[PDB]
Structure formats: structure tokens, C-alpha cells
Amino acid sequence: HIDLSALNPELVQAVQHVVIGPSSLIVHFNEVIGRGHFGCVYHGTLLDKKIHCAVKSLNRITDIGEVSQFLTEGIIMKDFSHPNVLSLLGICLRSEGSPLVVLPYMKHGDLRNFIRNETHNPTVKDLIGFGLQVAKGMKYLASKKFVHRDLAARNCMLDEKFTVKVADFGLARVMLPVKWMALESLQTQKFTTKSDVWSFGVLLWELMTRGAPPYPDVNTFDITVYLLQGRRLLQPEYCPDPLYEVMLKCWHPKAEMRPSFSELVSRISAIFSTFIG
Numbered sequence: 001h002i003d004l005s006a007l008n009p010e011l012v013q014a015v016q017h018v019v020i021g022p023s024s025l026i027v028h029f030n031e032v033i034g035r036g037h038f039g040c041v042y043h044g045t046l047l048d049k050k051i052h053c054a055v056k057s058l059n060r061i062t063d064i065g066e067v068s069q070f071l072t073e074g075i076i077m078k079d080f081s082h083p084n085v086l087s088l089l090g091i092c093l094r095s096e097g098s099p100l101v102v103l104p105y106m107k108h109g110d111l112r113n114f115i116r117n118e119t120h121n122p123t124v125k126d127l128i129g130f131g132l133q134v135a136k137g138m139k140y141l142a143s144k145k146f147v148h149r150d151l152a153a154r155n156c157m158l159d160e161k162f163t164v165k166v167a168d169f170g171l172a173r174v175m176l177p178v179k180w181m182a183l184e185s186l187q188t189q190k191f192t193t194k195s196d197v198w199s200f201g202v203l204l205w206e207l208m209t210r211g212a213p214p215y216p217d218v219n220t221f222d223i224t225v226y227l228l229q230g231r232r233l234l235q236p237e238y239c240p241d242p243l244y245e246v247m248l249k250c251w252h253p254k255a256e257m258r259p260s261f262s263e264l265v266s267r268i269s270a271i272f273s274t275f276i277g
């Protein structure tokens with residue numbers, strides 16, 4: 001509720017709670033590790049102990065009202081941190097004309113690119129483990145009243161230790177590609193944790209196919225009509241039977257009947273547990 005778009009004492013104090021000192025951050029301007037509609041994100045060094053980080057500059061501190069709600073929520077609610085959620089490390093106010101927003105560094109980038117890379121060899125166990133990590137991150141987001149709205153493998157990041165973090169690029173909200181949306185979202189534009197559970201099922205399917213495009217047999221214009229006839233994504237070749245049953249539960253047409261993220265954590269933890277060695 002505090003104003004993040006105009007200078008006021010509440011905004012200044014909230015940002016100070018997450019300040020990174022002027023001698024604590026170094027931006028490696030020649031190492032662009034993120035590019036998109038938002039511009040560039042640079043690799044950096046955070047002095048706490050030397051740690052890798054990712055830095056996005058702003059034109060001024062009042063531009064913080066325009067960044068992801070994962071970052072904005074942490075500053076406002078003071079309690080937002082989970083190993084499987086990509087959130088704020090801090091903000092460096094060293095230059096008034098260039099405040100620096102800093103997040104953790106994820107070496108392997110976006111999960112979809114990682115699993116599509118022909119040089120990488122993640123096993124089925126690794127892929128299912130990435131799915132379990134996403135469900136734990138989402139279970140935490142759901143507990144915080146967050147609705148992701150764009151859950152897909154391209155929005156999940158993978159770090160050097162193989163920790164997956166659910167990332168947000170401006171669409172999450174405290175409470176789109178059509179082939180990831182729940183039926184009731186395609187029909188009524190309503191988004192809840194249950195519509196994220198539907199996107200999660202699609203995410204699992206992306207992991208089991210190593211990033212294949214969903215519904216190769218269905219045009220974008222016909223996806224809703226296809227789902228209305230009870231049709232769903234087919235079981236990928238290396239997907240265990242109980243994992244596909246979990247996927248089908250995620251795509252139940254009645255939102256109330258889909259499992260919660262806590263139950264997904266439990267079911268996927270039991271399947272992942274069978275991958276020994």
C-alpha cells in the first residue's frame with residue numbers, strides 16, 4: 001500500500017531495510033547475463049564473503065514501483081524468501097542516478113533453454129527433481145497469496161548448484177501464452193493458485209519432453225475447444241506413469257478438483273524418491 005512511485009519517507013525507509021552498502025557491490029558491465037523487454041541485467045559481485053549476483057539498474061529509486069511484485073512484496077511485507085523463488089538480495093543506492101537492484105546469480109539461465117541445450121544431459125531424475133523444486137517454490141508463493149499467472153519452464157531459473165527458482169517478469173500478483181493457461185483462465189480470465197497448478201502440469205510436461213512445444217497437433221486458436229473436448233497433452237516417452245497421472249490431475253477441468261501445490265510436493269517427492277543412485 002505504501003507508494004513506491006514517488007519519494008516519501010515510507011518508501012525510503014522500506015528500501016533502506018534492504019540496502020547494500022556503497023562499498024559492497026561491483027557491477028561487471030561487460031557481462032550481460034539477462035536480456036529481454038526489461039533491458040539488460042549484468043553479472044555482479046556482492047561483498048557480504050564474495051558472492052555472485054545479478055544487477056539491474058534503474059533511472060531512479062521511484063522506478064522500483066515498476067519492477068516485479070516478488071521484489072516489491074519483499075520490500076513491503078518484510079517476509080519473502082524461499083530457496084526455490086528468485087527474489088531480492090538487496091538494493092544499492094550508491095548513485096542517485098543509477099540505483100542497482102540485485103538478485104541471485106543463476107548460471108544455467110532459464111530452465112527451458114537448459115533442457116533444450118543439446119550439449120546438456122539431465123537424467124529423468126534430474127528433470128523430475130527440477131519439477132519438485134518448482135512445486136516447493138509455488139507452494140511458498142501460494143502461501144503468500146501470490147498468483148504467478150505465467151508459470152512455464154522459460155520462467156524458471158537454474159543456478160550452478162542445480163537449485164531451481166521460480167522467477168517473475170512482471171505478471172505475478174498478490175490476490176499470456178494460451179498453451180499454458182488453465183481452461184477457466186482461457187474462458188473467464190480468472191487466475192487463482194488452481195490455474196497456476198494447471199500451468200505447473202504443462203511445466204512438468206515440458207521437463208519430461210526436454211522442452212518440446214505443447215500440443216504440436218493443436219493450433220493456438222483451437223486450444224480452448226480442444227481442452228473442452230477432454231483432450232490433454234499425451235504422456236511423454238520417458239515420463240513415469242504416476243507422474244503423468246499427477247499431470248492429468250493438474251489439468252482437471254474443475255479448479256476445485258486439482259491438487260494443491262502442497263499435495264503436488266508430496267506426490268512428486270514420492271515419485272522422485274524411486275530414482276535411486
Ligand SMILES: Cc1ccc(-c2ccc3c(C)n[nH]c3c2)c2c1[C@H](N(C)C(=O)c1ncccc1C(F)F)CCC2
Pocket residue numbers: 033034038041053054055056066067068071101102103104105106107109110157167168169170171
Ligand atoms: C530486476 C531484476 C534483476 C535481475 C534479474 C535477473 C535476470 C537474469 C538472471 C540470471 C541468469 N541469473 N540471475 C538473474 C537475475 C531479473 C530482474 C527482473 N526484472 C527485470 C524486473 O523485475 C523488472 N525490472 C524493471 C522493470 C520491469 C521489471 C519486471 F516487469 F520484469 C525479474 C527477473 C529478471
